[model samples]
Every structure is written in C-alpha cells, then in structure tokens.
Target chain A: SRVKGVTIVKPIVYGNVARYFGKKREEDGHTHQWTVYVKPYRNEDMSAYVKKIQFKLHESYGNPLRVVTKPPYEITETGWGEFEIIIKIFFIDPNERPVTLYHLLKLFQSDTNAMLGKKTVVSEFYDEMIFQ
Target chain B: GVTIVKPIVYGNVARYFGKKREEDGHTHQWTVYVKPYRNEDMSAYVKKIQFKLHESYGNPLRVVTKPPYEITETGWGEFEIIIKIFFIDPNERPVTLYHLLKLFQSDTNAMLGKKTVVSEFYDEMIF
Candidate 1:
C-alpha cells in the first residue's frame, strides 16, 4: 500500500512595539524605538528552511532597505507614528515564489504587554510557511 | 547578462557486473557513485552530492560524505535520479546533474561490455 504525501508547515510570529519616556525635550528629539521580527511559530528553535526576510519601510524614510537573514527576523528604529510594515519572505528554491505580510505599528497596550517590561508591543501576528 | 561560475563535477555511473541483490530476490539493483573522468583528487573540496530518487519510490535516500560517494538501491522500473553536488563551503550553491537508471541489460551486450559501470553518462544536464 502507498502512503500519503505530506508537507511540513512551520509557525512564525511577527510584530513590533514602542514605549515613550515621561519627559520630552525638544532639542533631544530621539524618543521611541521599536522592532518587528519573524520567528518560529512554536516555542522551538529558529527555522532552518527560511532563507530571508525583507522589511519594506515607508517611502519617506530614505535608505530603509532592510533584509534579515539570520535568526530573529525583526528590525527596529526611532521616530514613528503608525506604519504598515510590508514584510516579504523569500526561500532557497529559485523557482519558489516569495510571500509578503503587512504589520501595523502599535503604541498602545494590550495582552502582550501584560506579561512584562515597559517596552510596549505595537502588534504581532501568527504566520506559517510550507516546506514543499 | 548574469553569468554563472560553477565547478565541473566529474563522475562515472556504471552497473555492478557481479551479484545484484534486492529486498526481494526478484527486484533489480544498481550502484551509483561519483568520481572525476581525469584527476580523482577533485573530490577534495566536493563535500558530497545528493542523490534524489524517483518520487514514486516513496521515501527519498541520501548518501552523505564518506569514502565512495555512492549508493546501491533497489527498484525494477527506470527513473531519473537528480544529482546535486555540494561543496565544503555551505555558501556555495550546489550544481544539478541528472542521470537515468536503466533496467534493461541485454545478456550479449552485458557479456561483451562487462558493463561493470556505465562509463558514458547518457543524460547529464549540467547547470
């Protein structure tokens, strides 16, 4: 008897967040910093199959070319409002078509911040990739 | 124009003229290995080459680095075995070469040729 053919799906989590200082200085403009990343969907080690992650920033931000190759597929920066970060995932297979995701920056609090420090997590989303 | 610079993989695939065993006695078997047509020492940097068998055979087989980058498998039907050559350095992209496994071996030709190994590669699409 022949067996069923199955593909493996890896889980990934991606998002960003920010926190503000109590005092504001006009001269010292640098205030908030945040990061967005793509990681294993489960509580496991980083995926070995994922080739690259590209963070497409806003047009106004010059030279915002971001391409993450190692673990912690995330990036951070200062000076921000709410940005829809376009994330593109690329694989090793040349024939493989890349996948993209959109993440909105979060400045407020939610269940994510409930567990820990002052660094307010903007937003996070669950994602999966098929190893075909 | 994008030009690809790749190393030339040299290897010969031939049949085992001696005993050919299978999981079942009736099944036909063959052995595949890698080597240079000239300098056998080219295998120094070549860590290993992957042997991707036919999908219909169900599970795939892998033969990593060791003496004789070779494989002996069982299958009566003929199919294309994907030959992917890897280097000692992971950053380097592996090359793709294909070889077809032949099932039909005529007795007269087998006796004349000895056919210990098929020296002449039939279909090797080097990339």
Candidate 2:
C-alpha cells in the first residue's frame, strides 16, 4: 500500500574528486583521473527502495551513459577537460519519478593550499530528494 | 525588521597515507571547508570563516577571508572542529558550527585504510 500525502525526503550527497598524475599524458592529453559518485548522507543504506543510478558523461567518450544497480554508485575515468554530468536516480516504486541532478566535473583546485600541494580536488554538495 | 536566510554545507575529508609516521604520530591528511550550498557566491554576505582546531598545534585558530573557505592539515587523532562563520553585516552575530573529524568508516566492518573518508552536513542560517 502506498502512503498518501506524506513527504519522504532523503538526504543525499554527490560529488567528484580528481587527482593529477605525476606526469601528464602526452598521447591523449589526459592529465588527471577523477571519480564521481552519489551516496546516502553518512552512508545510510538506500538500497532498500532506491533502484539504481544512471550517469551520463561527456559526449567525448564512447558509451557515455553508464548505470549502476548497487551501492557506491560511482564512475571513474581519466580526462583532461571538465564538463557537466547528468545524474539520474531511480526508485523501486513505479509511481516515483526518477530525480535528475547535475554536477560540474572539478579537475582544478581554487584553494591555493590544495593547488600548491597538488592535492586531490574535491567538489561535493549536500541535497535532499522529496518523494510523496 | 528584516530577515535573511542562506543554506550552507560544512564537512571534512581525511585521506590515509598507507602508513603511520613515527615522527609526528601523523597518519592521515585532512581538509575541511564551509561553502554555500548550490555553489553560490557567499562573499556578499559572508565576511570570513574561522576554523578553530585542537590546541595541540602551534596555531589553533585559522581564518580564511575569501571564497572556498577551507583549511588543510595533517593529524593522527579525531576530535571536534569548531567552525565560526562571520557575516559581512556587522550587526549580525557570528555563527558557530561543529563537525566531528571522521577518520574511520562507520560501517560494521570498520577499518581504516587508504580510502578517503568524507563526512559532511547541511544547515540553513537565518539572520
């Protein structure tokens, strides 16, 4: 039985972390490897009702649309450019519509300390999904 | 009378170095930050962020006046980080936020390894 008029909001976090290699690639111009993900806030289990996640990447790559049906929904790749990613989250219930999110790939650090130390660039956000 | 509200996110990420250093007893390097939610520019309203770390270090108070308000350091233990956000409006009082430095995974099979640990929270501030 589906509950009516009740608002179910789940807090989720999504982001990307990129790390530069000691030497840049000369052939493909790929300088850094990055990973982007969508996970429950504080590692709460979403596998119960959350069905899967679809990540659409830049058109530069072959088969840019990737799907994950399990926990730790993430994707990793090496690239030289930054682009916007389309992330869609689906639920188990047929009545619930999939939620779409957009995140910008961050390969460079705006913080001087991180840039000077050559640390991994992290770009993340905290958000909530409302389901009725 | 006027009211203002802004949503913000604060968190920390700690990365293990694979091995503990015997010299300073440091094992992980971490960075913490407070940023506007939805990636908005907070400089218009936010004056600065003061990060008060544990007093064991040389300088416990760290301040950042610009955007990307953050601090990076190395440590071996976990503790509470006091984040004080100052507003551009002198009439508004500064806000204090608390974040626990998370070093280990909260999973049942909790183990500290080379994986980067990230913990964060969201809140709305009204002035």
TM-score for each predicted model, relative to the true structure = 0.43, 0.55
Q: In angstroms, how far off is B49's CA in candidate 1? A: 44
Interface RMSD after interface superposition, each candidate: 26.3, 10.2
- Estimate, for each residue in A54-94, the C-alpha lDDT of model 2 and write its tens digit: 88999998889989898889999999999999999999977
> What class would a CAPRI assessor give candidate 1's docking?
incorrect
Candidate 1 C-alpha lDDT tens digits along A1-132? 966455545556688867765445366464566787777634454435668889988776667768888877788776546668889998875656788888887655653223222344446665666655
- Classified by CAPRI criteria, candidate 2 counts as incorrect
lDDT of 2 by residue, B1-127 (tens): 6777888889998876556665666777788988777534566688999999989866789899966687888888998989999999999999999999887666643464436688989999886
Report how far off residue B36 is in candidate 1 (Å).
47
The deviation in Å at residue B91 for candidate 1 is 48
- Check candidate 1 and list the clashing pairs: A11-A41, A12-A41, A17-A122, A37-A74, A106-A122, B14-B117, B14-B118, B15-B117
Candidate that scores best on TM-score: 2
